[PDB]
Design a protein around this ligand. Structure first.
Ligand SMILES: [Hg+2]
Ligand SMILES: [Hg+2]
Ligand SMILES: [Hg+2]
Ligand SMILES: [Hg+2]
Length: 410
């Protein structure tokens, strides 16, 4: 029988937390719609039990997947120091680490390690926020505007179709913001009512106005859908074309703020370093958290921003069939190191594993027979590839070494 020419020796998964309740409930959010936003079963920004289940499903699937690839045993708890789970200090990331462990190795109680001080932010997930390093204001301002086509105005102008679709779902025309409009000489418009400005600081970048509101609102509609709520968007979202149109406003903000190299490289350095060191063969040592690397499987519970920063820094681009959000809840950036049996050469493969919006909505259990969506990624700047199109260890290491910003390493 034909035998595999490659052998999986290491897996590093950077995952976004699972489905959570919206992070905010502001006055603006209520003024752009005459309707009442549905309530959630958990606290704002917290993981919902359903979100935990969905993550557990992926954990269940990865276990079956890894067993078939021979990296994890089919029975029993993984051997000590074989599986490592790290998570940002947030409740939602911590719980995602627990949901994955429970799904990967039920009743095994794998430890979810986090930074010791959980009341302070973890630089691993954003070195800017803690001051490890800073953004070049002028340079970042120029790069974002450049990618925006010169101005945020031209940027939004090109997405008015998506913006009017959002207004339709919000019944924005009968909203307070619209009704108490002073300049009613003109038609109600989200981009007009809320001009979007680019704000760049040493430790942060943001978009004010309709761009960020739209990006948040559309994500909330997706969350309702994934959460299984009766009628996401008050029942005004009836087809896949509408889902994509709405979410495009979300992916668009991430394109500008999280994918832009001038922000991405810096923001992803700590993770880039952890990933490379975890994938590079070495004797069981550390990098932080009281966890030994290298190992066999490393699961990192983070955020969508991290997935986008890594994509931008590694020059990885993707679209997920059946999933309008490019960095969906539970979404996994999978890094694997395979060894070519023929000559013992090392190769790295990158994928994006995720549950389609329907698999979330229907809470469909995952397995080898019913796997989650998956897209094999190609490192744009990698020259030395193998038959399967994987990048060589050396090639990948070169890519990581040039993308990272040393001043931002931990
Ligand atoms: Hg720990
Ligand atoms: Hg190490
Ligand atoms: Hg490792
Ligand atoms: Hg998102």
């Amino acid at each position: 029988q034909s035998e595999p020419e490659l052998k999986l020796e290491s897996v590093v998964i950077v995952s976004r937390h699972g489905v959570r309740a919206p992070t905010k409930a502001t006055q603006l959010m209520q003024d752009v719609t005459p309707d009442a936003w549905p309530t959630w079963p958990v606290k704002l920004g917290w993981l919902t039990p359903r979100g935990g289940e969905l993550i557990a499903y992926l954990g269940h699937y990865q276990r079956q997947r890894l067993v078939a690839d021979g990296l994890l045993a089919k029975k029993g708890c993984p051997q000590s120091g074989q599986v490592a789970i790290i998570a940002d200090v947030d409740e939602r990331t911590r719980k995602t680490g627990e949901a994955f462990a429970a799904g990967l190795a039920p009743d095994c109680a794998i430890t979810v390690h986090t930074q010791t001080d959980t009341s302070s932010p973890d630089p691993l997930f954003n070195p800017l926020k803690t001051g490890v390093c800073q953004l070049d204001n002028a340079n970042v301002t120029d790069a974002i505007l450049s990618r925006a086509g010169g101005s945020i105005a031209d940027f939004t102008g090109h997405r008015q179709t998506a913006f009017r679709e959002l207004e339709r779902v919000l019944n924005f025309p009968q909203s307070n913001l619209c009704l108490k409009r002073e300049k009613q000489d003109e038609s109600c418009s989200l981009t007009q009512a809320l001009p979007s400005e680019l704000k760049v600081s040493a430790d942060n970048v943001s978009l004010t106005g309709a761009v960020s509101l739209a990006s948040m609102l559309t994500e909330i509609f997706l969350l309702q859908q994934a959460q299984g709520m009766p009628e996401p968007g008050w029942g005004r979202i009836t087809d896949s074309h509408q889902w994509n149109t709405l979410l495009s406003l979300h992916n668009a903000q991430f394109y500008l703020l999280q994918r832009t190299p001038e922000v991405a490289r810096s923001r992803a350095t700590p993770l880039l370093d952890l990933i490379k060191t975890a994938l590079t063969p070495h004797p069981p040592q550390k990098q932080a958290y009281g966890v030994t690397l290298p190992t066999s499987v490393l699961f990192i519970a983070g955020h969508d921003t991290n997935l986008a920063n890594l994509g931008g820094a590694l020059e990885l681009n993707w679209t997920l069939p059946g999933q309008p959000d490019n960095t969906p809840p539970g979404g996994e950036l999978v890094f694997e190191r395979w060894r070519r049996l023929s000559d013992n050469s090392q190769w790295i493969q990158v994928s994006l594993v995720f549950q389609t919006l329907q698999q979330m909505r229907d809470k469909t259990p995952l397995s080898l027979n019913t796997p989650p969506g998956e897209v094999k990624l190609t490192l744009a700047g990698c020259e030395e590839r193998n038959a399967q199109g994987m990048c060589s260890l050396a090639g990948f290491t070169q890519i990581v070494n040039e993308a990272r910003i040393p001043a931002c390493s931990l």
